[PDB]
């Protein structure tokens, strides 16, 4: 009931395959070349202990940064000034080219998506979701326009407990056990969402990027997987491929799944800090990206978890805006994610780490503290 | 009750991550930087339809090579004449670069892994699997040697019906869904398995190959992922790396689930005609070689699905030996698996396929007049 999906290949019917149909045919021409979409999967490495630290450049005016890095769980941290990486940090046993979980920097990268096909005019985002996705009607997604999705200004009644909706969102996704009852993917999920109706306050919530990637899919007929390589990936002459784990019917879990390195997240910043050019293209318009950078509605910013330390915060278009006088704009992604622009000194800083905890005010205190000094540190003297 | 296995990262419980646990400390570290090995994942392409055929060089001895290859449903096709690439093909949608799934030509790696540590005098095939692995005391594999594994010598109760053990043993490893009273591990699954007691005839079965890949974890404390890389795949000098299916212990599934590119797989042949050696260093001892080219015991082949075609054949260290005057050796998956062994001519053959059917008779005499016919058009004319 929640009507066509991109096909998983060229003719598979909706659905399929599953874990239980791969490996028979015509499924299994596709399944056996891309079997890490069906089953977890290991590297088995082609290369035969300690952490790597070259912070530059930046040592100097940042003395005690290895150990704040530490302290703040760091896995990778890179520093890219202009088109040069001044800084870098990898935590013993991650190296420079391994890839690293996004958690919500991910809905960066898939307003990034919908903004390409804002450019190209596929998308209208001041018309309703239900004009790309008719089957959300009757949900609290009937009624707010697709902008309204971008800049998370819906009300939703979303509990951050299995029957809380965060953990039903990830049993719907394939990153928890199901349980008895639970929706069979995160379409039928999205569509079990509700809301009092009211719009125009910002409340953070994850479904609205899954809604997002879910338009992408009915706009350009292709996957997201696909959407997120064609429409921004593909363009950035990025080290590797990315990664995105996908629901059982392939859907890639757009709000939260994708993981890349550091260095190649570094060129999604390079990207808006080039007035949404790319090496392979055009990713977003010259207005997308400013409209990213002045932010959104500051009156609809009521999230004192991010207003005590910007006060003239906002959030637009799966960005946080912090508003102060930096104009730093931020992905941010829980456990200590961040994707920071410092227009200011032209420079992108990449923060990837695994704090203990999804969020507490200690922790992104701490984040934040280094990512302005950092960001100051650059500042010409 | 199947005793010590390998953490999955260092300090780790038993068993840790889940599914359930994996976005949790200390686990989360780990586990946001292999989150392929917990959930299900797509590539997002850094790259932006038609078949590649460059078959030689042998297209003037075989005319109706490329139509041959598509009538048994090929993938990827590659022939490596002593260190040069002579003849390739790929079909529409398969890029060069591309990994396949190699069912049970994974066996042949494994045994490989086996003989590696043999050659080091950590593993001597005379012992019982229970000086290895004592929590298999009271199985089927309670008394065989090891050497009786590689060779699959071991009269088993096992179903080749969600109730047969093949299935059971899919389920078992995550490659099907589970049922309730399923084991809950590889490990596990293979301790439920009975047989007569008899050994010396040949039997093929999949759990001898996972139960090798439980005594080189005994014997090393290595994650099979991680032996297998360390003992070969980082031995190869590689292009890519291999991935592998693994269990929720993970376990690799070292029966069936590795997949790598043709032209990976084609240096893991290339080994074997090299005596033993690879880039890296040696893999296997001279006389590991020597025993594969050799073949087992013609007595104990009793299948007549391979002796019908290969009359004096037989099987031996995870190795099917043709015994025909080629002297042909060759790795063997169900849908049309193959690295196959030409030492006359110096040739390492590897096919990958996807065939609608596991196994016929029909299937394996046309994918068989392939692999012959190519093999006789690099002989010196």
Same mark, same amino acid.
């Given at each position: 009931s929640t009507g066509q999906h991109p096909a998983r290949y060229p003719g598979a019917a909706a659905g399929e395959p599953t874990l239980d149909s791969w490996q028979e045919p015509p499924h299994n021409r596709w399944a056996f070349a891309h079997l890490g979409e069906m089953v977890p999967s290991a590297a088995v490495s082609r290369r035969p202990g300690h952490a790597l630290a070259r912070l530059g450049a930046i040592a100097a005016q940042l003395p005690d940064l290895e150990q704040r890095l530490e302290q703040t769980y760091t896995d990778a941290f890179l520093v890219l000034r202009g088109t040069e990486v001044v800084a870098e940090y990898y935590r013993a046993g991650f190296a420079p080219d391994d890839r690293h979980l996004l958690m919500s920097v991910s809905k960066s990268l898939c307003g990034t998506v919908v903004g390409a096909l804002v450019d190209e005019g596929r998308?209208? &985002?001041?018309? &309703?979701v239900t004009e790309y996705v008719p089957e959300l009607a009757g949900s609290v997604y009937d009624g707010p326009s697709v902008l309204q999705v971008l800049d998370m200004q819906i009300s939703i009644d979303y509990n951050e407990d299995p029957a809380s909706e965060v953990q039903t969102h990830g049993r719907s996704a394939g990153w928890r056990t199901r349980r008895h009852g639970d929706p069979a993917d995160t379409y039928e999920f999205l569509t079990t969402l509700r809301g009092d109706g009211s719009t125009g306050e910002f409340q953070y919530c994850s479904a609205n990027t899954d809604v997002l990637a879910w338009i992408v899919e009915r706009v350009t007929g292709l996957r997201y997987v696909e959407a997120l390589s064609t429409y921004l990936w593909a363009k950035l002459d990025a080290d590797r491929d990315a990664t995105i784990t996908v629901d059982t019917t392939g859907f890639g879990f757009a709000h939260g799944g994708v993981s890349c390195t550091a260095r190649d997240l570094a060129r999604v910043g390079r990207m808006m800090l080039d007035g949404g050019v790319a090496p392979g293209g055009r990713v977003v318009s010259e207005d997308w990206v400013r409209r990213v950078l002045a932010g959104g509605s500051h009156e609809a910013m009521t999230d004192k978890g991010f207003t005590n330390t910007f006060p003239d915060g906002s959030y637009t278009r799966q960005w946080w805006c912090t508003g102060n006088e930096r104009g730093n704009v931020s992905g941010i992604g829980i456990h200590g994610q961040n994707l920071w622009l410092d227009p200011l000194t032209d420079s992108v800083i990449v923060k990837l780490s695994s704090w203990p905890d999804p969020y507490t005010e200690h922790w992104h205190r701490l984040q934040n503290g280094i990512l302005l000094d950092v960001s100051r540190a650059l500042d010409a003297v």
């Open positions: 998308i209208d &985002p001041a018309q &309703p």
